[PDB]
Amino acid sequence: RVTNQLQYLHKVVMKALWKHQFAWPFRQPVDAVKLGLPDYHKIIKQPMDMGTIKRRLENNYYWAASECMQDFNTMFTNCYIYNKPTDDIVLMAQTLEKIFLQKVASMPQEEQELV
Amino acid sequence: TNQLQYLHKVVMKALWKHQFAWPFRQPVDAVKLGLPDYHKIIKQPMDMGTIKRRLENNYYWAASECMQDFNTMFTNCYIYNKPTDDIVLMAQTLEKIFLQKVASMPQE
Ligand SMILES: CCc1onc(C)c1-c1ccccc1
Numbered sequence: 001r002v003t004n005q006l007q008y009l010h011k012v013v014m015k016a017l018w019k020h021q022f023a024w025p026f027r028q029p030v031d032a033v034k035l036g037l038p039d040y041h042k043i044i045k046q047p048m049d050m051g052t053i054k055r056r057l058e059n060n061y062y063w064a065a066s067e068c069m070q071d072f073n074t075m076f077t078n079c080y081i082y083n084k085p086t087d088d089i090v091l092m093a094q095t096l097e098k099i100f101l102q103k104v105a106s107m108p109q110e111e112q113e114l115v
Numbered sequence: 116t117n118q119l120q121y122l123h124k125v126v127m128k129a130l131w132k133h134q135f136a137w138p139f140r141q142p143v144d145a146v147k148l149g150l151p152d153y154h155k156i157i158k159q160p161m162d163m164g165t166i167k168r169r170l171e172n173n174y175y176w177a178a179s180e181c182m183q184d185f186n187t188m189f190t191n192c193y194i195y196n197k198p199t200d201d202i203v204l205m206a207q208t209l210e211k212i213f214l215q216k217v218a219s220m221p222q223e
């Protein structure tokens with residue numbers, strides 16, 4: 001569907017996060033071969049990234065805004081679970097997620113489809 | 116505010132009573148749990164008891180500020196614990212409810 005909330009997530013949330021200076025590691029799936037992480041998919045069972053979320057928003061994949069929000073959440077949570085506390089990537093994730101939450105605070109309150 | 120009232124009476128109430136919520140209702144007690152490295156790794160402790168008290172005492176100026184505290188609580192859990200620890204699954208479950216409920220908060 002196309003809803004007011006999903007439009008907000010696309011036009012405000014994804015817009016802000018996609019172009020952020022710390023976004024680059026999150027713009028495509030974690031490539032375990034490229035990064036040399038043979039345990040990544042053993043630990044992270046549901047990979048998620050902003051390229052996938054962006055494509056899903058562009059293709060009207062989501063039925064509800066909550067579904068998109070859960071994908072954002074999974075992406076960040078995967079990062080915190082896999083990486084060491086002191087890794088820079090954790091700081092980058094935290095910075096992006098703070099923006100996510102700040103913007104989500106102003107999202108339309110009721111979901112409804114555009115005719 | 117309208118949003119802070121919602122975070123207190125709708126969001127926090129639902130999370131608080133959940134069967135996986137008990138570890139999160141008060142600060143992590145590193146002494147009781149025997150974890151000398153907890154406060155060396157987690158520099159901003161947060162829990163729902165602290166958030167609830169802040170809501171009750173009008174500490175927050177905006178809903179976003181309160182939401183950030185919820186996020187810090189969950190993130191601390193993911194950062195400190197092993198991926199396979201049950202507490203991680205408990206946090207994930209509560210976090211999903213948090214986002215579900217936040218989606219329906221008044222927009223202002
Ligand atoms: C295992 C490292 C890692 O964990 N989460 C992300 C994102 C990354 C990442 C880091 C650098 C480039 C691309 C992804």
Ligand SMILES: CCc1onc(C)c1-c1ccccc1
Nearest residue numbers: 138139143150192195196202
């Ligand atoms: C260090 C373990 C831990 O990490 N986050 C929480 C919450 C807990 C916790 C686990 C059991 C009881 C109380 C808190």
